[PDB]
Amino acid sequence: ATFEIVNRCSYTVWAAASKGDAALDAGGRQLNSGESWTINVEPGTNGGKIWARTDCYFDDSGSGICKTGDCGGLLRCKRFGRPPTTLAEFSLNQYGKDYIDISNIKGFNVPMDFSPTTRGCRGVRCAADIVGQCPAKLKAPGGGCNDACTVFQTSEYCCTTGKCGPTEYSRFFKRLCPDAFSYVLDKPTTVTCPGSSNYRVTFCPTA
């Protein structure tokens, strides 16, 4: 499946794509304002994610550091990134279907839209100005908005036991971005697409 990744922000981002223990395609690439990067992802990829990293520096060997979304100091990511990160999440060809969503469970750094480019389902969007409106205790000095699990580490925020509910902090994300997951056991906003769809992820989808 092809994913076209488009940077519509006014700043450079470093796109990253991984399934947790391996890179998807080249795993990572710089995208200046306006650039697109098409990648190919193996069918049957379960638990893939794509996200953006901000304010990065890499040397010639491709090692360095990012202010948000850092995946162990590498340009070409193999693991998931350090919160806060808005996440495009997907599982392909799962008993005939594709499953996509956007999650704020690890916070928010960049607004995003995640849509199929082929026929037969709708896309999702989390384009609100979450960073500007963040509650004081969740603001990341590093840039971006942390989720409450990262900041406080309690069973209730992390849904450690499998029995958590909504909280003052999860309700903040949900009010700004109703179509994204705001906590683990949130009522699903996953979209079901035909198996083998293609996709576009756009950073900063609106002016």
Side-chain angles (χ1 to χ4, degrees):
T2 62
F3 282 69
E4 181 175 42
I5 302 172
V6 175
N7 188 13
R8 174 163 320 146
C9 305
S10 62
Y11 43 87
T12 299
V13 309
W14 286 258
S18 164
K19 78 179 181 57
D21 52 345
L24 298 179
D25 196 277
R29 216 206 82 180
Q30 184 174 333
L31 266 44
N32 290 317
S33 180
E35 305 195 300
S36 310
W37 180 31
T38 300
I39 56 153
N40 287 275
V41 172
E42 201 188 28
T45 296
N46 194 40
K49 301 187 197 302
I50 283 160
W51 65 104
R53 303 170 278 178
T54 61
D55 302 302
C56 299
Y57 298 94
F58 298 100
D59 70 25
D60 305 339
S61 60
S63 279
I65 185 141
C66 292
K67 286 220 198 181
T68 72
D70 203 37
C71 60
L74 302 167
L75 178 55
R76 286 191 36 139
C77 293
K78 331 179 236 265
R79 320 300 264 212
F80 294 145
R82 182 177 194 270
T85 51
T86 315
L87 299 169
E89 314 194 290
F90 55 87
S91 291
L92 311 180
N93 304 103
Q94 303 292 304
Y95 299 90
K97 291 300 168 168
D98 286 2
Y99 294 93
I100 76 186
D101 71 60
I102 288 174
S103 171
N104 281 324
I105 286 157
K106 304 305 207 164
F108 179 95
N109 65 335
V110 177
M112 159 195 296
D113 175 278
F114 186 10
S115 291
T117 51
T118 49
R119 68 106 223 151
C121 55
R122 68 188 191 265
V124 289
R125 183 176 295 208
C126 176
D129 183 25
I130 287 169
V131 168
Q133 303 286 5
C134 191
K137 286 185 183 125
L138 303 177
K139 279 169 198 313
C145 192
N146 286 134
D147 51 302
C149 174
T150 297
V151 173
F152 292 106
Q153 296 290 282
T154 74
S155 292
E156 192 60 12
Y157 302 135
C158 309
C159 309
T160 301
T161 72
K163 268 280 149 70
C164 66
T167 66
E168 172 172 311
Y169 297 117
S170 71
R171 284 179 194 95
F172 162 74
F173 295 93
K174 201 52 174 185
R175 174 173 64 82
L176 274 282
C177 274
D179 286 328
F181 283 85
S182 63
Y183 69 107
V184 170
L185 297 186
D186 208 350
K187 168 220 198 177
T189 38
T190 311
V191 174
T192 301
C193 291
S196 286
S197 295
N198 301 310
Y199 305 89
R200 186 181 282 119
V201 180
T202 314
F203 300 127
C204 306
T206 42

